[PDB]
Design a protein around this ligand. Sequence first.
Ligand SMILES: Cc1ccc(CN2CCS(=O)(=O)N(CCc3ccc(S(N)(=O)=O)cc3)C2)cc1
Ligand SMILES: [Zn+2]
Length: 258
Amino acid sequence: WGYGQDDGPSHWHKLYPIAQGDRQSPINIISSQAVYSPSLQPLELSYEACMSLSITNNGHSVQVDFNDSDDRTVVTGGPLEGPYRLKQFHFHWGKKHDVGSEHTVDGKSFPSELHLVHWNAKKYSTFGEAASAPDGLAVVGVFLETGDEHPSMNRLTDALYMVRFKGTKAQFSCFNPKSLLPASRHYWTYPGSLTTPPLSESVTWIVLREPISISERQMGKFRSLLFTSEDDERIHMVNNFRPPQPLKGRVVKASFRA
Ligand SMILES: Cc1ccc(CN2CCS(=O)(=O)N(CCc3ccc(S(N)(=O)=O)cc3)C2)cc1
Ligand SMILES: [Zn+2]
């Protein structure tokens, strides 16, 4: 599977039937239809500064992995019952600036979307095990728009050249993911799935209301990454996103009033 013309999202169901399931992600969030839920707890992203390990081009995205041996870097509150440890973060983006994000809001897409992936380590033994359970994962999504240069983002975009080819990785120490967060903690939440195969319906999605901004130069660095290996013909990593899926009666809750 991939994001090309022949192995892209519209064909994933041929391999993973759950692709046509009842709690698939991403979705188009219709703001006026989300339900204000004042019973939700405050969302807290408690991240340490030096828990990052490496940055890798896995052929589908660029991902930063974290040390998750303890609960020093976790998300808690909001719709979650307990803390979920951060395992990794990655991005989805487009070839053009009018597309790239997985989730959309009122039919609007952003050029990119950041996914901070957490798991219920207090309850499950491995990330893979948690990924098989309805309450196993929590992914915080942050939209990216282009505008002013993002200072912290420079560390990440400067490291992309060395991982331009599929299957390569580099050490990436002391990058605090809190630096990629907006000043607001308002969000939308709904029960969903992983947005890439195996498409398991084990994710509690937390999509932040406020996007962060990066420069066009920085966004351009992501488009310089490749889906291909060093020997293969070059194919730039772009449009690595899954389009919105049917809501199927699910209720989207909001921590705020629109
Ligand atoms: C590029 C890639 C490599 C390996 C796999 C295999 N996969 C098996 C089940 S797992 O152990 O739970 N894990 C899923 C990884 C994941 C996918 C999507 C999202 S997302 N976009 O919904 O935030 C968050 C996290 C690895 C899939 C994709
Ligand atoms: Zn993702």
